[PDB]
């Protein structure tokens, strides 16, 4: 029943595609109020619609200076992988090949 | 950029009543299942003070009389019951995206009982006169509402030029306003006239409050 | 114990630069964004940007990019803002604030910037003595630059019934007045003195209010 992290995140492992077409990322929390839920969302390029899905069940910051693994199923094509609140918010580009 | 539109620009609310102010975002300020908008209170001469974060979460230590509501684009701040120390300007802010933007602000006026000004007139001091200056000062203190007109008379003739006015902010304890009106003249013009009058016309009376002195 | 102490009011010539400071204490300076907010006189709030002192990351509002430069020093727990090629639109109060959580929870007291080619000048302080039950007295603080002045009565012993009016600006000079109300039984048996300070000209004037007669 944790609230969202208010601080910032650093990319420790850049987006990599798995053999299942999913993506994995590792981010490390900078700030306080942890344990806290990592704010995570996938959007279209216009930042108007939330897309895809988190595979990681409730990603929580549980350690000081240690990365947290996040796995997600992005939509096909271009999307933004958005992590953390503003002004530190990470905005990562991703392209998933194929169609449904 | 997101535009935060505050409504109304100003409002007067009676002591103990309920005050509701509105803030509309030009686009959704929601992310991660939450509303990235916050409410602040700014009292004269002070920095803004955070009241509510994420549209509805009351800051620690702030009275439960303040309530935030809303999601996406439509938000409100409620003050219930209104107290004297609530005399302030209220701002909404979004931080869902960069640049972070503020609403134009809503000034809250505390509506107390009408009170006539206590009027006091003061001749130029000897100190000022010896340096060729002549400022005639008039205080119009602790009145309600703020709307007042001051009229200066020199030997019964109205004088509009050389008058500077200054109003205090609404008092945080008694909810009144005070005002100073200064008529600056040359030592020469001051010395060639005798009767100096400060006339206040306030809602409290159809008869003006007239204070005066004779230079002699 | 969270505190943000800002530097004093400043005057700067048009086209010059200023560097303002914001000293933080009472929290881990490197664990929160330190943000800057501008307020023009009688106007609203505008977000300039934020700095993360832990790695010197910055986020600016585009309109301040060529104008403002944010820096931070880990060692002294101090954030700075440099304002360049100063114009009249830059005259404002500049606040620093900590983004403790979802929003700005702790704020500095603000630093006033006056963009002007006007010269520092001390005020003249004039007593305002009447020309029943309660008497109103006052002080006229005329012709000073820049703001502010501090006005007290009997070294702060008379605080109730005091009205210190916002200064009025005319011909590059500020003029202000202050009134005090006391019982008629107390004046002139008990002395009434206004204490006027103008820090920019290192002026401290004590003005005793004497009955005219
Ligand atoms: Cl913020």
């Amino acid at each position: 029943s944790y609230s969202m992290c208010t601080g910032k995140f650093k990319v420790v492992k850049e987006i990599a595609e798995t053999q299942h077409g999913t993506i994995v990322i590792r981010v490390q929390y900078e700030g306080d109020g942890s344990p806290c839920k990592i704010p995570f969302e996938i959007m279209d390029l216009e930042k108007r619609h939330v897309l895809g899905r988190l595979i990681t069940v409730n990603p929580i910051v549980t350690e000081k200076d240690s990365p947290v693994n996040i796995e997600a199923e992005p939509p096909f094509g271009d999307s933004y992988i958005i992590i953390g609140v503003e002004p530190g918010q990470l905005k990562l580009n991703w392209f998933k090949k194929g169609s449904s | 950029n997101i535009v935060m539109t505050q409504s109304p620009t100003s409002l007067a609310v009676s002591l103990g009543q309920r005050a509701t102010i509105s803030c509309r975002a030009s686009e959704s300020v929601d992310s991660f299942g939450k509303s990235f908008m916050h409410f602040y209170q700014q009292k004269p001469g002070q920095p803004p003070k955070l009241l509510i974060h994420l549209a509805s979460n009351l800051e620690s230590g702030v009275p439960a009389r303040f309530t935030g509501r809303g999601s996406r684009t439509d938000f409100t701040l409620t003050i219930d019951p209104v107290e004297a120390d609530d005399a302030a300007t209220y701002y909404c802010q979004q931080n869902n995206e960069v640049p972070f933007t503020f609403g134009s602000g809503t000034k809250l006026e505390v509506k107390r009982a009408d009170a006539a000004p206590t009027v006091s007139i003061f001749p130029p001091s000897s100190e000022q006169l010896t340096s060729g200056g002549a400022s005639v000062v008039c205080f119009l203190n602790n009145f309600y509402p703020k709307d007042i007109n001051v009229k200066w008379k020199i030997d019964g003739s109205e004088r509009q030029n050389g008058v500077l006015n200054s109003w205090t902010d609404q008092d945080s304890k008694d909810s009144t306003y005070s005002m100073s009106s200064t008529l600056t003249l040359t030592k020469d013009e001051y010395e060639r006239h005798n009767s100096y009058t400060c006339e206040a016309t306030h809602k409290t009376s159809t008869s003006p409050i007239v204070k005066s002195f004779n230079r002699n | 114990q969270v505190q943000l102490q800002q530097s004093g009011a400043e005057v700067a010539r048009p086209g010059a630069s200023v560097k303002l400071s914001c000293k933080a204490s009472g929290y881990t300076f490197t664990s929160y964004w330190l943000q800057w907010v501008k307020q023009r006189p009688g106007q609203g709030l505008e977000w300039i940007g934020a700095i993360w002192p832990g790695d010197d990351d910055t986020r600016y509002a585009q309109k301040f990019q060529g104008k403002a430069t944010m820096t931070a020093d880990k060692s002294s727990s101090t954030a700075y803002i440099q304002l360049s090629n100063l114009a009249s639109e830059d005259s404002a109060v500049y606040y620093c604030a900590r983004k403790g959580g979802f929003a700005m929870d702790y704020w500095g007291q603000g630093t006033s910037v006056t963009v002007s080619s006007a010269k520092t000048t001390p005020p003249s302080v004039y007593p305002l003595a009447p020309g029943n039950s309660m008497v109103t007295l006052g002080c006229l603080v005329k012709g000073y630059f820049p703001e502010p002045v501090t006005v007290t009565w009997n070294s702060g012993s008379l605080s109730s019934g005091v009205h210190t009016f916002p200064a009025v600006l005319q011909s590059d000079l500020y003029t202000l007045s202050s009134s005090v109300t006391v019982p008629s039984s107390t004046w002139p048996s008990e002395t009434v003195t206004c204490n006027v300070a103008h820090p920019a000209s290192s002026t401290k004037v004590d003005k005793k209010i004497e009955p005219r007669d």
Side-chain angles (χ1 to χ4, degrees), chain A residues 6-8 29-31 33-34 64 87-88, chain C residues 2 4 24-35 50-57 72 79 97-103 105-106:
Chain A
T6 60
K8 81 174 180 78
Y29 188 54
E30 307 167 345
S34 87
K64 215 76 178 178
Chain C
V2 181
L4 299 162
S25 56
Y27 73 97
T28 314
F29 188 55
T30 58
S31 286
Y32 304 87
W33 287 95
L34 184 286
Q35 312 197 147
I51 190 160
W52 181 271
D55 58 21
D56 297 305
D57 274 23
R98 180 189 86 161
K99 195 180 174 280
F102 291 110
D105 57 358
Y106 290 92

mmCIF file of all heavy atoms in Angstrom, chain A residues 6-8 29-34 64 87-88, chain C residues 2 4 24-35 50-57 72 79 97-103 105-106, unseen atoms left out:
data_model
loop_
_atom_site.group_PDB
_atom_site.id
_atom_site.type_symbol
_atom_site.label_atom_id
_atom_site.label_comp_id
_atom_site.label_asym_id
_atom_site.label_seq_id
_atom_site.Cartn_x
_atom_site.Cartn_y
_atom_site.Cartn_z
ATOM 1 N N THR A 6 8.921 10.090 -4.970
ATOM 2 C CA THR A 6 8.900 11.503 -5.358
ATOM 3 C C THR A 6 10.243 11.987 -5.935
ATOM 4 O O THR A 6 10.313 13.082 -6.487
ATOM 5 C CB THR A 6 8.453 12.389 -4.163
ATOM 6 O OG1 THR A 6 9.371 12.205 -3.084
ATOM 7 C CG2 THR A 6 7.029 12.053 -3.673
ATOM 8 N N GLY A 7 11.288 11.216 -5.753
ATOM 9 C CA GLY A 7 12.621 11.617 -6.193
ATOM 10 C C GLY A 7 12.936 11.188 -7.610
ATOM 11 O O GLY A 7 12.030 10.914 -8.409
ATOM 12 N N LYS A 8 14.226 11.147 -7.941
ATOM 13 C CA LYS A 8 14.586 10.779 -9.296
ATOM 14 C C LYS A 8 15.245 9.454 -9.475
ATOM 15 O O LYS A 8 15.664 8.817 -8.518
ATOM 16 C CB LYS A 8 15.253 11.918 -10.080
ATOM 17 C CG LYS A 8 16.726 12.167 -9.858
ATOM 18 C CD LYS A 8 17.131 13.234 -10.876
ATOM 19 C CE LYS A 8 18.577 13.645 -10.842
ATOM 20 N NZ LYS A 8 19.416 12.634 -11.517
ATOM 21 N N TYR A 29 17.140 4.457 -7.746
ATOM 22 C CA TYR A 29 16.504 5.613 -7.107
ATOM 23 C C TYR A 29 17.499 6.560 -6.436
ATOM 24 O O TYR A 29 18.453 6.124 -5.787
ATOM 25 C CB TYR A 29 15.459 5.153 -6.078
ATOM 26 C CG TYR A 29 14.597 6.258 -5.490
ATOM 27 C CD1 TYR A 29 13.890 7.136 -6.318
ATOM 28 C CD2 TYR A 29 14.439 6.391 -4.109
ATOM 29 C CE1 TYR A 29 13.068 8.120 -5.790
ATOM 30 C CE2 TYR A 29 13.624 7.387 -3.565
ATOM 31 C CZ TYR A 29 12.926 8.234 -4.412
ATOM 32 O OH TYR A 29 12.110 9.209 -3.909
ATOM 33 N N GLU A 30 17.247 7.862 -6.586
ATOM 34 C CA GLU A 30 17.992 8.944 -5.940
ATOM 35 C C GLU A 30 16.865 9.774 -5.280
ATOM 36 O O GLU A 30 15.904 10.177 -5.945
ATOM 37 C CB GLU A 30 18.792 9.787 -6.960
ATOM 38 C CG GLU A 30 19.716 9.015 -7.893
ATOM 39 C CD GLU A 30 20.247 9.806 -9.074
ATOM 40 O OE1 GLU A 30 19.697 10.888 -9.366
ATOM 41 O OE2 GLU A 30 21.198 9.333 -9.733
ATOM 42 N N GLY A 31 16.945 9.943 -3.984
ATOM 43 C CA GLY A 31 15.914 10.655 -3.245
ATOM 44 C C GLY A 31 15.554 9.905 -1.985
ATOM 45 O O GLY A 31 16.255 8.968 -1.601
ATOM 46 N N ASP A 32 14.452 10.297 -1.365
ATOM 47 C CA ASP A 32 13.972 9.666 -0.139
ATOM 48 C C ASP A 32 12.542 9.173 -0.230
ATOM 49 O O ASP A 32 11.934 9.177 -1.313
ATOM 50 N N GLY A 33 12.002 8.790 0.929
ATOM 51 C CA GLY A 33 10.654 8.246 1.039
ATOM 52 C C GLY A 33 10.543 6.783 0.622
ATOM 53 O O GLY A 33 9.438 6.237 0.555
ATOM 54 N N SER A 34 11.659 6.125 0.345
ATOM 55 C CA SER A 34 11.602 4.700 -0.013
ATOM 56 C C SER A 34 11.452 3.805 1.269
ATOM 57 O O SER A 34 11.925 4.232 2.323
ATOM 58 C CB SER A 34 12.795 4.306 -0.870
ATOM 59 O OG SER A 34 13.897 3.941 -0.056
ATOM 60 N N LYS A 64 19.089 1.073 -0.896
ATOM 61 C CA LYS A 64 19.860 2.283 -1.106
ATOM 62 C C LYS A 64 20.891 1.949 -2.179
ATOM 63 O O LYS A 64 21.515 0.880 -2.119
ATOM 64 C CB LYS A 64 20.576 2.670 0.218
ATOM 65 C CG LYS A 64 20.691 4.178 0.462
ATOM 66 C CD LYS A 64 19.363 4.788 0.915
ATOM 67 C CE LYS A 64 19.449 6.261 1.209
ATOM 68 N NZ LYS A 64 18.125 6.821 1.596
ATOM 69 N N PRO A 87 10.550 17.143 -11.807
ATOM 70 C CA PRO A 87 11.323 17.398 -13.043
ATOM 71 C C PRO A 87 12.367 16.366 -13.435
ATOM 72 O O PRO A 87 12.977 16.534 -14.490
ATOM 73 C CB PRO A 87 11.961 18.771 -12.767
ATOM 74 C CG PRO A 87 12.192 18.767 -11.289
ATOM 75 C CD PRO A 87 11.081 17.933 -10.677
ATOM 76 N N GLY A 88 12.568 15.325 -12.626
ATOM 77 C CA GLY A 88 13.574 14.299 -12.934
ATOM 78 C C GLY A 88 13.174 13.190 -13.901
ATOM 79 O O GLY A 88 13.991 12.341 -14.268
ATOM 80 N N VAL C 2 13.973 22.135 8.191
ATOM 81 C CA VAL C 2 14.231 22.502 6.792
ATOM 82 C C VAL C 2 14.177 24.015 6.674
ATOM 83 O O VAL C 2 13.192 24.632 7.084
ATOM 84 C CB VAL C 2 13.296 21.805 5.767
ATOM 85 C CG1 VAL C 2 13.644 22.228 4.334
ATOM 86 C CG2 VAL C 2 13.362 20.282 5.906
ATOM 87 N N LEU C 4 15.709 27.467 4.043
ATOM 88 C CA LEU C 4 16.330 27.990 2.821
ATOM 89 C C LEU C 4 16.544 29.498 3.057
ATOM 90 O O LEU C 4 15.568 30.242 3.149
ATOM 91 C CB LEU C 4 15.463 27.725 1.568
ATOM 92 C CG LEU C 4 15.172 26.247 1.231
ATOM 93 C CD1 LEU C 4 14.016 26.122 0.314
ATOM 94 C CD2 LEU C 4 16.410 25.538 0.645
ATOM 95 N N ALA C 24 20.705 26.169 1.883
ATOM 96 C CA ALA C 24 19.851 25.160 2.491
ATOM 97 C C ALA C 24 20.452 24.557 3.744
ATOM 98 O O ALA C 24 21.670 24.372 3.832
ATOM 99 C CB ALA C 24 19.567 24.062 1.494
ATOM 100 N N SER C 25 19.588 24.198 4.699
ATOM 101 C CA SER C 25 19.975 23.480 5.908
ATOM 102 C C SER C 25 18.803 22.615 6.368
ATOM 103 O O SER C 25 17.668 22.866 5.970
ATOM 104 C CB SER C 25 20.411 24.444 7.010
ATOM 105 O OG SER C 25 19.412 25.403 7.309
ATOM 106 N N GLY C 26 19.086 21.609 7.190
ATOM 107 C CA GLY C 26 18.062 20.760 7.787
ATOM 108 C C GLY C 26 17.588 19.556 7.010
ATOM 109 O O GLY C 26 16.633 18.909 7.436
ATOM 110 N N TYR C 27 18.228 19.250 5.866
ATOM 111 C CA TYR C 27 17.906 18.092 5.015
ATOM 112 C C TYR C 27 19.099 17.732 4.111
ATOM 113 O O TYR C 27 20.037 18.524 3.984
ATOM 114 C CB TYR C 27 16.608 18.321 4.183
ATOM 115 C CG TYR C 27 16.743 19.298 3.033
ATOM 116 C CD1 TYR C 27 16.971 18.852 1.736
ATOM 117 C CD2 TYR C 27 16.672 20.671 3.244
ATOM 118 C CE1 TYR C 27 17.118 19.746 0.676
ATOM 119 C CE2 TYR C 27 16.808 21.575 2.193
ATOM 120 C CZ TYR C 27 16.992 21.106 0.903
ATOM 121 O OH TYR C 27 17.091 21.988 -0.153
ATOM 122 N N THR C 28 19.037 16.567 3.450
ATOM 123 C CA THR C 28 20.081 16.137 2.514
ATOM 124 C C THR C 28 19.877 16.926 1.208
ATOM 125 O O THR C 28 19.024 16.578 0.387
ATOM 126 C CB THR C 28 20.043 14.616 2.334
ATOM 127 O OG1 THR C 28 19.927 14.032 3.618
ATOM 128 C CG2 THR C 28 21.282 14.070 1.611
ATOM 129 N N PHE C 29 20.657 18.011 1.060
ATOM 130 C CA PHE C 29 20.648 18.949 -0.066
ATOM 131 C C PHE C 29 20.693 18.268 -1.443
ATOM 132 O O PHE C 29 20.045 18.724 -2.393
ATOM 133 C CB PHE C 29 21.822 19.937 0.091
ATOM 134 C CG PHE C 29 21.843 21.089 -0.888
ATOM 135 C CD1 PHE C 29 20.740 21.929 -1.027
ATOM 136 C CD2 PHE C 29 22.961 21.333 -1.674
ATOM 137 C CE1 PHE C 29 20.773 23.007 -1.915
ATOM 138 C CE2 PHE C 29 23.000 22.429 -2.546
ATOM 139 C CZ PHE C 29 21.901 23.241 -2.673
ATOM 140 N N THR C 30 21.456 17.171 -1.534
ATOM 141 C CA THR C 30 21.665 16.405 -2.760
ATOM 142 C C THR C 30 20.532 15.422 -3.097
ATOM 143 O O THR C 30 20.598 14.772 -4.140
ATOM 144 C CB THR C 30 23.038 15.717 -2.701
ATOM 145 O OG1 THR C 30 23.083 14.881 -1.542
ATOM 146 C CG2 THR C 30 24.198 16.718 -2.694
ATOM 147 N N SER C 31 19.497 15.317 -2.242
ATOM 148 C CA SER C 31 18.408 14.345 -2.415
ATOM 149 C C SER C 31 17.070 14.918 -2.883
ATOM 150 O O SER C 31 16.085 14.181 -2.901
ATOM 151 C CB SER C 31 18.208 13.544 -1.129
ATOM 152 O OG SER C 31 19.251 12.606 -0.959
ATOM 153 N N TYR C 32 17.014 16.225 -3.230
ATOM 154 C CA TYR C 32 15.781 16.905 -3.645
ATOM 155 C C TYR C 32 16.096 17.937 -4.707
ATOM 156 O O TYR C 32 17.201 18.480 -4.714
ATOM 157 C CB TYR C 32 15.128 17.632 -2.439
ATOM 158 C CG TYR C 32 14.842 16.724 -1.259
ATOM 159 C CD1 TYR C 32 15.816 16.476 -0.286
ATOM 160 C CD2 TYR C 32 13.616 16.071 -1.135
ATOM 161 C CE1 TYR C 32 15.579 15.592 0.769
ATOM 162 C CE2 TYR C 32 13.375 15.173 -0.096
ATOM 163 C CZ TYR C 32 14.353 14.949 0.866
ATOM 164 O OH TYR C 32 14.099 14.095 1.923
ATOM 165 N N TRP C 33 15.126 18.246 -5.581
ATOM 166 C CA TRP C 33 15.327 19.323 -6.537
ATOM 167 C C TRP C 33 15.167 20.631 -5.772
ATOM 168 O O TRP C 33 14.310 20.739 -4.873
ATOM 169 C CB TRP C 33 14.266 19.280 -7.648
ATOM 170 C CG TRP C 33 14.453 18.168 -8.632
ATOM 171 C CD1 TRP C 33 13.855 16.946 -8.601
ATOM 172 C CD2 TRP C 33 15.301 18.173 -9.793
ATOM 173 N NE1 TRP C 33 14.285 16.178 -9.662
ATOM 174 C CE2 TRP C 33 15.146 16.919 -10.431
ATOM 175 C CE3 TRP C 33 16.104 19.149 -10.412
ATOM 176 C CZ2 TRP C 33 15.819 16.591 -11.627
ATOM 177 C CZ3 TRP C 33 16.747 18.837 -11.610
ATOM 178 C CH2 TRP C 33 16.638 17.555 -12.181
ATOM 179 N N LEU C 34 16.008 21.611 -6.108
ATOM 180 C CA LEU C 34 15.948 22.947 -5.541
ATOM 181 C C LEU C 34 15.483 23.778 -6.717
ATOM 182 O O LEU C 34 16.140 23.803 -7.765
ATOM 183 C CB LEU C 34 17.346 23.411 -5.026
ATOM 184 C CG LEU C 34 17.450 24.780 -4.303
ATOM 185 C CD1 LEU C 34 17.351 25.973 -5.284
ATOM 186 C CD2 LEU C 34 16.523 24.869 -3.103
ATOM 187 N N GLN C 35 14.328 24.414 -6.560
ATOM 188 C CA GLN C 35 13.663 25.139 -7.640
ATOM 189 C C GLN C 35 13.618 26.653 -7.423
ATOM 190 O O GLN C 35 13.735 27.129 -6.303
ATOM 191 C CB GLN C 35 12.253 24.550 -7.846
ATOM 192 C CG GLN C 35 12.276 23.004 -7.937
ATOM 193 C CD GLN C 35 11.051 22.353 -8.531
ATOM 194 O OE1 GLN C 35 11.151 21.315 -9.201
ATOM 195 N NE2 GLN C 35 9.862 22.889 -8.247
ATOM 196 N N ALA C 50 14.689 24.023 -12.099
ATOM 197 C CA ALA C 50 15.146 23.226 -10.971
ATOM 198 C C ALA C 50 16.571 22.696 -11.183
ATOM 199 O O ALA C 50 17.001 22.446 -12.323
ATOM 200 C CB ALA C 50 14.202 22.048 -10.775
ATOM 201 N N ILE C 51 17.275 22.489 -10.071
ATOM 202 C CA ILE C 51 18.607 21.906 -10.065
ATOM 203 C C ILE C 51 18.624 20.745 -9.093
ATOM 204 O O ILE C 51 18.058 20.863 -8.020
ATOM 205 C CB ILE C 51 19.770 22.935 -9.808
ATOM 206 C CG1 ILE C 51 21.164 22.278 -10.070
ATOM 207 C CG2 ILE C 51 19.687 23.595 -8.415
ATOM 208 C CD1 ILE C 51 22.299 23.189 -10.326
ATOM 209 N N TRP C 52 19.288 19.638 -9.450
ATOM 210 C CA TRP C 52 19.458 18.515 -8.541
ATOM 211 C C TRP C 52 20.928 18.599 -8.097
ATOM 212 O O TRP C 52 21.816 18.264 -8.874
ATOM 213 C CB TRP C 52 19.118 17.184 -9.238
ATOM 214 C CG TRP C 52 19.237 15.967 -8.363
ATOM 215 C CD1 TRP C 52 20.356 15.206 -8.164
ATOM 216 C CD2 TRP C 52 18.188 15.346 -7.606
ATOM 217 N NE1 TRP C 52 20.074 14.163 -7.311
ATOM 218 C CE2 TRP C 52 18.740 14.200 -6.987
ATOM 219 C CE3 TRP C 52 16.819 15.616 -7.428
ATOM 220 C CZ2 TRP C 52 17.982 13.353 -6.171
ATOM 221 C CZ3 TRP C 52 16.075 14.775 -6.619
ATOM 222 C CH2 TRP C 52 16.649 13.647 -6.025
ATOM 223 N N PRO C 53 21.209 19.119 -6.872
ATOM 224 C CA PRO C 53 22.619 19.309 -6.457
ATOM 225 C C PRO C 53 23.497 18.053 -6.389
ATOM 226 O O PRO C 53 24.714 18.170 -6.422
ATOM 227 C CB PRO C 53 22.507 20.040 -5.115
ATOM 228 C CG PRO C 53 21.105 20.671 -5.142
ATOM 229 C CD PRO C 53 20.272 19.642 -5.851
ATOM 230 N N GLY C 54 22.875 16.877 -6.320
ATOM 231 C CA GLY C 54 23.572 15.594 -6.295
ATOM 232 C C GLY C 54 24.358 15.279 -7.555
ATOM 233 O O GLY C 54 25.344 14.549 -7.495
ATOM 234 N N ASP C 55 23.950 15.834 -8.707
ATOM 235 C CA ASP C 55 24.648 15.584 -9.975
ATOM 236 C C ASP C 55 24.657 16.799 -10.921
ATOM 237 O O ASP C 55 25.123 16.681 -12.053
ATOM 238 C CB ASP C 55 24.070 14.335 -10.667
ATOM 239 C CG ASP C 55 22.578 14.418 -10.949
ATOM 240 O OD1 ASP C 55 22.047 15.540 -10.994
ATOM 241 O OD2 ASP C 55 21.957 13.358 -11.167
ATOM 242 N N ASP C 56 24.117 17.952 -10.471
ATOM 243 C CA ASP C 56 24.058 19.199 -11.248
ATOM 244 C C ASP C 56 23.160 19.153 -12.476
ATOM 245 O O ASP C 56 23.323 19.951 -13.402
ATOM 246 C CB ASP C 56 25.470 19.771 -11.536
ATOM 247 C CG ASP C 56 26.204 20.145 -10.258
ATOM 248 O OD1 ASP C 56 25.650 20.943 -9.456
ATOM 249 O OD2 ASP C 56 27.296 19.595 -10.024
ATOM 250 N N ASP C 57 22.169 18.240 -12.457
ATOM 251 C CA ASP C 57 21.151 18.141 -13.500
ATOM 252 C C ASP C 57 20.244 19.341 -13.325
ATOM 253 O O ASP C 57 19.962 19.717 -12.191
ATOM 254 C CB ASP C 57 20.312 16.856 -13.353
ATOM 255 C CG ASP C 57 20.910 15.628 -14.011
ATOM 256 O OD1 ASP C 57 22.142 15.601 -14.215
ATOM 257 O OD2 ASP C 57 20.148 14.690 -14.313
ATOM 258 N N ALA C 72 24.873 24.945 -8.227
ATOM 259 C CA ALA C 72 24.762 24.465 -6.856
ATOM 260 C C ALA C 72 26.101 23.993 -6.409
ATOM 261 O O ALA C 72 26.870 23.460 -7.212
ATOM 262 C CB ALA C 72 23.741 23.322 -6.763
ATOM 263 N N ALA C 79 22.597 26.899 -3.357
ATOM 264 C CA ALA C 79 22.152 26.997 -4.734
ATOM 265 C C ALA C 79 22.281 28.460 -5.165
ATOM 266 O O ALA C 79 22.107 29.370 -4.339
ATOM 267 C CB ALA C 79 20.710 26.529 -4.845
ATOM 268 N N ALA C 97 12.985 27.162 -3.528
ATOM 269 C CA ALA C 97 12.076 26.259 -2.859
ATOM 270 C C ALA C 97 12.515 24.837 -3.044
ATOM 271 O O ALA C 97 12.988 24.453 -4.118
ATOM 272 C CB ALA C 97 10.636 26.438 -3.383
ATOM 273 N N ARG C 98 12.313 24.038 -2.008
ATOM 274 C CA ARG C 98 12.632 22.633 -2.090
ATOM 275 C C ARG C 98 11.417 21.846 -2.584
ATOM 276 O O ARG C 98 10.347 21.978 -2.009
ATOM 277 C CB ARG C 98 13.062 22.108 -0.718
ATOM 278 C CG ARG C 98 13.404 20.620 -0.772
ATOM 279 C CD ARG C 98 13.623 20.048 0.596
ATOM 280 N NE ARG C 98 12.372 19.623 1.207
ATOM 281 C CZ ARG C 98 12.314 18.767 2.217
ATOM 282 N NH1 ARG C 98 13.427 18.242 2.716
ATOM 283 N NH2 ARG C 98 11.145 18.398 2.713
ATOM 284 N N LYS C 99 11.612 20.935 -3.577
ATOM 285 C CA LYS C 99 10.544 20.022 -4.002
ATOM 286 C C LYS C 99 10.696 18.786 -3.115
ATOM 287 O O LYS C 99 11.293 17.788 -3.521
ATOM 288 C CB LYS C 99 10.633 19.655 -5.485
ATOM 289 C CG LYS C 99 9.324 19.021 -5.978
ATOM 290 C CD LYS C 99 9.375 18.651 -7.437
ATOM 291 C CE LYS C 99 8.120 17.898 -7.859
ATOM 292 N NZ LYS C 99 8.188 16.448 -7.473
ATOM 293 N N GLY C 100 10.241 18.902 -1.869
ATOM 294 C CA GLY C 100 10.388 17.833 -0.881
ATOM 295 C C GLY C 100 9.704 16.532 -1.225
ATOM 296 O O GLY C 100 10.167 15.451 -0.839
ATOM 297 N N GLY C 101 8.571 16.656 -1.902
ATOM 298 C CA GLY C 101 7.740 15.533 -2.316
ATOM 299 C C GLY C 101 7.179 15.776 -3.693
ATOM 300 O O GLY C 101 7.937 15.970 -4.657
ATOM 301 N N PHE C 102 5.846 15.772 -3.792
ATOM 302 C CA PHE C 102 5.103 15.989 -5.048
ATOM 303 C C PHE C 102 5.094 17.462 -5.502
ATOM 304 O O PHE C 102 4.804 17.760 -6.663
ATOM 305 C CB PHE C 102 3.688 15.404 -4.936
ATOM 306 C CG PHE C 102 3.687 13.880 -4.878
ATOM 307 C CD1 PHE C 102 3.358 13.211 -3.700
ATOM 308 C CD2 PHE C 102 4.093 13.123 -5.974
ATOM 309 C CE1 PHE C 102 3.370 11.803 -3.640
ATOM 310 C CE2 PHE C 102 4.137 11.711 -5.907
ATOM 311 C CZ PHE C 102 3.749 11.065 -4.744
ATOM 312 N N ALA C 103 5.405 18.379 -4.577
ATOM 313 C CA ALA C 103 5.358 19.826 -4.838
ATOM 314 C C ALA C 103 6.380 20.583 -3.966
ATOM 315 O O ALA C 103 7.198 19.939 -3.305
ATOM 316 C CB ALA C 103 3.934 20.337 -4.607
ATOM 317 N N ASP C 105 7.430 22.158 -0.849
ATOM 318 C CA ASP C 105 7.019 22.172 0.575
ATOM 319 C C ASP C 105 7.712 23.236 1.398
ATOM 320 O O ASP C 105 7.079 23.856 2.243
ATOM 321 C CB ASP C 105 7.151 20.762 1.204
ATOM 322 C CG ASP C 105 8.523 20.088 1.148
ATOM 323 O OD1 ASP C 105 9.469 20.678 0.565
ATOM 324 O OD2 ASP C 105 8.664 19.008 1.725
ATOM 325 N N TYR C 106 9.002 23.498 1.117
ATOM 326 C CA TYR C 106 9.731 24.533 1.835
ATOM 327 C C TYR C 106 10.239 25.595 0.897
ATOM 328 O O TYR C 106 10.798 25.283 -0.150
ATOM 329 C CB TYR C 106 10.857 23.931 2.680
ATOM 330 C CG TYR C 106 10.319 23.158 3.865
ATOM 331 C CD1 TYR C 106 10.064 21.796 3.771
ATOM 332 C CD2 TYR C 106 10.088 23.788 5.093
ATOM 333 C CE1 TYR C 106 9.572 21.075 4.857
ATOM 334 C CE2 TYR C 106 9.589 23.076 6.186
ATOM 335 C CZ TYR C 106 9.355 21.714 6.069
ATOM 336 O OH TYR C 106 8.884 20.979 7.128
#
